[PDB]
Amino acid sequence: XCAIDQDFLDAAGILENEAIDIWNVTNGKRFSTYAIAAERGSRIISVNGAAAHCASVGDIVIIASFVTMPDEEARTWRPNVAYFEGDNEMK
Amino acid sequence: XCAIDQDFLDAAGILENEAIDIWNVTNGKRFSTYAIAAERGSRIISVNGAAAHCASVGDIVIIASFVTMPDEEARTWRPNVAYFEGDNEMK
Amino acid sequence: XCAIDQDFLDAAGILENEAIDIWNVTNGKRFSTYAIAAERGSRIISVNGAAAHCASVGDIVIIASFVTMPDEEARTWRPNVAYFEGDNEMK
């Protein structure tokens, strides 16, 4: 896979080659793959490979990454959330 | 996503933003997402976003979280379990 | 399971008994199992047991393994990737 505009990766704290879960709001499909960085500013969200069977151009999806940490740190942990609208306009 | 009454999260030892598995007893669907806290005493169990394709109001579900620990600790580990009935009445 | 030519495992850095994700490019199925080593040079990719319900001889698949590491190490991490063509000819 899933090429994502590098600006999006930076905002959500997601790294290239990191595991990500993709939950499809449009068709309800949920799958896991890994992140690839796409050119900055392109606003690209490309589902490549076998994953092309789970999402179509135009589908709304939620992409998430998970990390592990000691319970004491988890208590105050805060995730990096980026919101979008229109044609991948980061609001 | 799944907003869960903070009291329920407290009883099960589940943290906000922690990854959770939801197993639908009603329809048999099994999915993973993360927990969000709902105001205490609200008794809310809300499946939002893409998750709304896997559960409906009225469905009976089991919500579980998993943690990692060394083998010795694992052998003496006791899970935090809460049982429900009726109008999400804890026992 | 999935017996994989030991040479292929070597190129991808995959270990025997290591958990692997198999993404079927042909039918779109995605499943997880563990790797078994097949004799070197055999070029075997065998889906055995319950896995045989997700892949058939002839199917094109992507086999991946994931590891965990601290954030600093993650940012400089480079995956071991092997590409194939024809009769499972590595490039």
């Binding site: 490309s46 940490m69 990096n80 959330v81 | - | -």
Partner: peptide
């Protein structure tokens, strides 16, 4: 014990391209 937490997420992005034959 170690917890698995949400690191971050891109909420409601649109798939712009799908390439089944991708080899990279």
């Amino acid at each position: 014990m170690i917890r698995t937490m949400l690191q971050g997420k891109l909420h409601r992005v649109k798939v712009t391209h799908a390439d089944l034959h991708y080899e990279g």
